[PDB]
Design a protein around this nucleic acid. Structure first.
Lengths: 237, 228
DNA sequence: CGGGATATCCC
DNA sequence: GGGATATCCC
């Protein structure tokens, strides 16, 4: 399927290559640093061609944002069906020891999920799927092309997975002032297998559309999945 | 000097795999920020060596500055260098938080704020204009996500404005002007002392700033008032 | 854990 | 001018 093939291509290309730097028209090569700002940029760029090709095999079109700060990284769809869109977002995080617990920031919880047309390419309801391509990496002179093998890398053991956002979503925020949804805090395996805490995508969306911004307000409402469900049981009170 | 030299030392089109496949750039700003920083590190390190200065980047991620230069002899004469980028279709940059290291000497900074003697800003300005990969010899067919790019070096305090560069992330806003004013260093502050005092007492929201000051005129009237 | 840092932009 | 975009830190 579009999805099986997408995961297949990503895992293959990744388990194969390694980006080692940026290159100028003149042929000079600048190495990379081990900050997630760099690696994020790198991993997003490394994925766009693959996404494009797979999207093409399945007759989908691929569109990116025209203005920045608008979700998602890639919007796929078929013209003959402009309402069943797929949202693909590439998220990155790191690890020092291999197979350690990781967590991702999964997007704002006061934007497009609350206001159908807020900071999003297309109105929220036009998408039927929200996929996250997560990358996990381990943190470890200009150059000539003929040197492409000696340039050192600021990363190791790069792992990647694709999973539906709601599935790997957690019940705790990923950020404070930037009010981001936090993912589950787990091993790479649970992400692949989709061992999340929500039962449905409606449960996911409800919990975050009502999540209070601060622990003080949440202390009155709910601070976690257990209290959310109790909150529901009582009649949202 | 170290400064004129770097000024003097001062067309990337993709990332490359050790294999040799060239992955293009996205026409965005988070991309170019990363690009421009990577492009700068070599230049800075080459010039730094010339002057017997050590270059240290951060270990922790949310730690200013991008680069710390210094002679192993004079460890309290450190220089802070930070790369900032903006785009053109007058411009403005975000110049760093005004609630961190400028109010708390050792907060989110590689070395205690008191050990730095200069805070330089290397600014890049680009004019914003392929989902295929390419090969080394195809470099001439890859579409660029930017039409032009200007760069400048300047002291942080000289190009600082009186309005915040961001709300929830509380950044210092630069002056809102032409590239030439940046290079000219046509600021609004009279000194680095005034720049620091203005941003040290800045309130986060407008309502709180409403009974203090929200611009340079107001700050000056507030000082005369006896800082209240 | 949650608040708030890192950089830059938009309604 | 407040709050979006991505991810991290203690």
């Amino acid at each position: 399927s579009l999805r099986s093939d997408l995961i297949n291509a990503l895992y293959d290309e990744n388990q194969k290559y390694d980006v080692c730097g940026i290159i100028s028209a003149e042929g000079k090569i600048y190495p990379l640093g081990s900050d997630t700002k760099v690696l994020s940029t790198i991993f997003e760029l490394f994925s766009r061609p693959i996404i494009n090709k797979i999207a093409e095999k399945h007759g989908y079109i691929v569109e990116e944002p025209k203005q920045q700060n608008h979700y998602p990284d890639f919007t796929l769809y078929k013209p003959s069906e402009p309402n069943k869109k797929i949202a693909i977002d590439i998220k990155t995080t790191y690890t020092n020891k291999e197979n350690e617990k990781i967590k991702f920031t999964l997007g704002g919880y006061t934007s497009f999920i609350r206001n159908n047309t807020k900071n999003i390419v297309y109105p929220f309801d036009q998408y039927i799927a929200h996929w996250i391509i997560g990358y996990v990496y381990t943190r470890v002179k200009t150059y000539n092309i003929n040197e492409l093998n000696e340039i050192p890398k600021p990363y190791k053991g790069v792992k990647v997975f694709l999973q539906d956002k709601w599935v790997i979503a957690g019940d705790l925020a990923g950020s404070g002032n930037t009010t981001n949804i936090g993912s589950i805090h787990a091993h790479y395996k649970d992400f692949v297998e989709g061992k999340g805490i929500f039962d449905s995508e409606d449960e996911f969306l409800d919990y975050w559309r009502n999540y209070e911004r601060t622990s003080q307000l949440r202390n009155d409402k709910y601070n976690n999945i257990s209290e959310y469900r109790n909150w529901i049981y009582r009649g949202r009170k």
